[PDB]
Amino acid sequence: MLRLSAPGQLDDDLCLLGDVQVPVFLLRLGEASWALVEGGISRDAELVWADLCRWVADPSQVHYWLITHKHYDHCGLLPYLCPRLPNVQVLASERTCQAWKSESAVRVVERLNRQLLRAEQRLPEACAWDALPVRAVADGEWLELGPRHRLQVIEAHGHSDDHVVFYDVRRRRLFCGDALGEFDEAEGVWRPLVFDDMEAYLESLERLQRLPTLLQLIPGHGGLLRGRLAADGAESAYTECLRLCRRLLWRQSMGESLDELSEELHRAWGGQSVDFLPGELHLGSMRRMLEILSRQALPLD
Amino acid sequence: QGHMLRLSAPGQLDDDLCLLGDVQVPVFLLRLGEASWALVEGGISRDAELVWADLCRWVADPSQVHYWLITHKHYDHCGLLPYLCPRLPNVQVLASERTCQAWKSESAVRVVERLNRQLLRAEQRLPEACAWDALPVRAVADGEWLELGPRHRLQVIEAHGHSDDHVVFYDVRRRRLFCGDALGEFDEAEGVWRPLVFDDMEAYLESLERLQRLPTLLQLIPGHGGLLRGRLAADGAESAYTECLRLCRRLLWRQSMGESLDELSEELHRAWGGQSVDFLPGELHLGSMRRMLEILSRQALPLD
Amino acid sequence: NDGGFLLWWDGLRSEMQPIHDSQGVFAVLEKEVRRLGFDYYAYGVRHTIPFTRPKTEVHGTYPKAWLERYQMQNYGAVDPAILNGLRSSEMVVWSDSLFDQSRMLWNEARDWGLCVGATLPIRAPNNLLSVLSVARDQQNISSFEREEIRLRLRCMIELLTQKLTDLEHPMLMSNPVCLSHREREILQWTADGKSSGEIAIILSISESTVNFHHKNIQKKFDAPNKTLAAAYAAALGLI
Amino acid sequence: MRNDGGFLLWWDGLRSEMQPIHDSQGVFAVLEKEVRRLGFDYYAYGVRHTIPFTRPKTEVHGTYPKAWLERYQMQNYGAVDPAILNGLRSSEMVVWSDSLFDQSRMLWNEARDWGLCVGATLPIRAPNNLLSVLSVARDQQNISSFEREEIRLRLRCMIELLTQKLTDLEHPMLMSNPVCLSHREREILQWTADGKSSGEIAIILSISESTVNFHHKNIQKKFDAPNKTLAAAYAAALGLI
Ligand SMILES: CCCC(=O)N[C@H]1CCOC1=O
Ligand SMILES: CCCC(=O)N[C@H]1CCOC1=O
Ligand SMILES: [Fe+3]
Ligand SMILES: [Fe+3]
Ligand SMILES: [Fe+3]
Ligand SMILES: [Fe+3]
């Protein structure tokens, strides 16, 4: 095939834990050293710890936890699993940590996570946000995680005011979260997810195109992409973002409102993220992206 | 004039350019001088009496029509010649040697006649017609400068890909480009290009490449939809290239999952065919979709 | 719309132009090298003279003990990775066959972990031989990455030599000798085989003057005769 | 292959397309094809030799109008052509510009007359101290900056691979002067070019002075040289020592 999509081991060193919609990633740095990536949601902790048990014998050997940004679908496990990995250093951008320190952001995230539980699921134990084992990282910081894992951090603002991505130089493997968008499983192209700034989004896609040719591309939803899909991932994401810009500007030149295209985009796309995103929030996010684009897009003559 | 980005209405389009007939299958008129005129695009047959009427509003004498530029051989861009050339004594039909010889090949002209005869309005009465090999044709070559008028100097550019004979015309003075179907069918509802690769994808993409290199366009006139202007016409070639590669990626992904060409043909038809119901039978549109998908599956670069 | 590689090229240029100190230039070089996936790098300048013992200066991030050993045994003289540049401009992937003639150097380098690597040569516009090497310990060079690397290394060494010459680094500097148009032209004629009298005739001056100019030139080159002067001038691109 | 999907694809396609070529004409043909693919009308490839130091040879081969080549060599404009001479001082590409030709106004005016109105030139130095140069030219469209970089990269690749293949085919334009020295003669010349006399070389190499002088005679015979100064200078210039 051309797309990997299943919990468990991805390749000789990595594992996907939990739900492929809101997945967590597990690095085996050495014989007795592990690390985590993506903070997931509360709804999937009950799947996390268990499915994790199949691969790790001792949970105490998790030493790092990487977070892309502060969205609920990539962070909502700090109360669930963090207390039980005592030697773990959460590593996150100043923006992300400061967001975790604010009460309003954690309230929003908690509500959005609560909106996804089952009528039978009971909440496991929880802890506080300002008490997390946090450490600020910087753009381009080198993370000597393991003898065969030297990953660099790259600031990818755009999808949010804090998004960051991780590049394993040895395996040419890029964890990108949502900076490229939501991969269309039916068509094979990128769906832009501009929820903060369009110029930062596009410049981040540019800076990512400057990396060596990619072999493995790992977004926040869908799984892992290999081959051509991973190589020109940033190029295609940029192209699709500009395509949406052009569509919106054309529709506006004909006298159509952002509501028209927002509803159309919901109808055509929201079906993919129905399991981890209330449809009304999908429509609202489509409208937010369309507004940002209409604000920052280049006009015509 | 106008603030708009797309002019899609019969009448005057510019100080020297008018659109005639149906905006779907238009025929463009250029005023080379006080008593000299030229035509562009051949349109479809059933518009003969319409175009003529419109033409007569602008030109006081049909003998003043001296040139008629044709992009390619497809039925929908040369069906007016046999019916209206008899009324234009002083006209030279200008097309690519491949197109000119196509007008000599019995089978091609039979296909043209059948497809154009199928687009009549109930009891339409075609006017008399002259032979295809009897047209007043002068073949042109790649890069030739057509001295149509003192202020009309158009260059011929080979745009193979859409067909084995497609060519386009660049009026360099006005940075105007009659591109026919070399870029595809413009999506009037979305503002993007629909690839129309019906012969060779390598040649189609190489032609779009070469066209990207032209001076920044101010007027982009395809065979369907009217005239584009401003930024829409400036980056038309690059946008067509991008949409073609996008469709390539979509086809290749759908095949990596185990789909057939005809499934995506049905999808693309349901999504696009609505624009060309007036001048293209649906079955032929679906067949063209299947053929473009064949060519893309053959010549597209795999993903391994 | 013409390749995502252009983005990397322009980014490197923009990152390296505002730098006015060689330390930052080498730092950017290491940045990109490590971003590619290698552990260490090196940049070497082989001069053309003395022809018997050619100068080979180096700067990089190999272990200091390994460089001590390198200069102690003057491995710069007969290092195959460097000597490739004398006859070819193509990149060299480190391999046993390459080092069959200088096996001790390769054995000791392998002892230092420098097990996989490559070296790309280029010729500066002043007849100097600059070379850029990258190295890691455990992963062999794959084919597609082989070519991608080759290209990136070419671009980087081009821009590096340019920026270091613009920064007037000592490693690129050569023996400082300046000749006036008259003396340079006299040397051009001598290096073309003309005698003192023939040069005097052509330049419409005396032969005593021409021999005095020869004395001047040799005095500058610290040379015993005109053969050394002519050869070193030809090697340095001064005539 | 040379295609579309990425620059690396075009690179590998060009390499594979040029590997089977056993004729220099086909190499130049592939080069011209890619040049026109880039967007220019004519191209040129020039080789500036280092000697004779007074009048260094500058050979040229390309697709400029033949009348322009007639004029170029007739008046030997190649000697002080700025596009070539830049390569002696820089590894950077040179985009043709009025300011660049302020020194050689006649050449620039005549080139403009022949349609060579827009163009660029990229220099490189072969590992034998030759100055190779690849120029491209068109008539009506000025070079923008983004296209400047695109060109720079593609022309660099193309000229590198071209010089490689032409050295592999032993083209007469690059062959300069075929001279081969024996190990003994080459080391003797290395010592002489370092300033050693016949007797000092005889001592060092543990041979007689008559043998060293006879080796000098042979070396002079190969270089068609009247003395040892010319031999040493030309060997140093040609990278033989
Ligand atoms: C001038 C750079 C030469 C270089 O890095 N050579 C490598 C080959 C293996 O061990 C080395 O030292
Ligand atoms: C060897 C390259 C020389 C070259 O490209 N010359 C150009 C500059 C302008 O008119 C020419 O003839
Ligand atoms: Fe997100
Ligand atoms: Fe997400
Ligand atoms: Fe057509
Ligand atoms: Fe058509």
Residue numbers in the entry:
A (entry chain B): 1 to 301
B (entry chain A): -2 to 301
C (entry chain D): 3 to 241
D (entry chain C): 1 to 241
Paper text:
The majority of traits controlled by rhl transcription factor RhlR depend on PqsE, a dispensable thioesterase in Pseudomonas Quinolone Signal (PQS) biosynthesis that interferes with RhlR through an enigmatic mechanism likely involving direct interaction of both proteins. Here we show that PqsE and RhlR form a 2:2 protein complex that, together with RhlR agonist N-butanoyl-L-homoserine lactone (C4-HSL), solubilizes RhlR and thereby renders the otherwise insoluble transcription factor active. In common with many other gram-negative bacteria, two QS circuits use N-acyl-L-homoserine lactones (HSLs) as autoinducers, namely N-(3-oxododecanoyl)-L-HSL (3-oxo-C12-HSL) and N-butanoyl-L-HSL (C4-HSL), which are produced by autoinducer synthases LasI and RhlI and activate the LuxR-type transcription factors LasR and RhlR, respectively.
Interactions between PqsE and RhlR do not involve the autoinducer binding site or the DNA-binding domain (DBD) of RhlR, suggesting that complex formation does not directly interfere with the ability of RhlR to sense C4-HSL and bind to its cognate promoter regions. The homoserine lactone moiety of C4-HSL establishes a hydrogen bond with the side chain of W68, whereas the amide group engages into hydrogen bonds with Y64, D81 and S135. To validate their relevance, we introduced alanine mutations and investigated their impact on complex formation in E. coli coexpression experiments as well as on pyocyanin production in P. aeruginosa. This revealed the importance of several (e.g. RhlR: D41, E147, E150; PqsE: R150, R170, R172) but not all residues (e.g. RhlR: Q140/Q141; PqsE: R148) within the larger contact area 1, whereas mutation of residues exclusive to contact area 2 had no effect. Notably, only the N-terminus of PqsE is accessible in the complex, explaining why tagging at other termini abrogates complex formation.
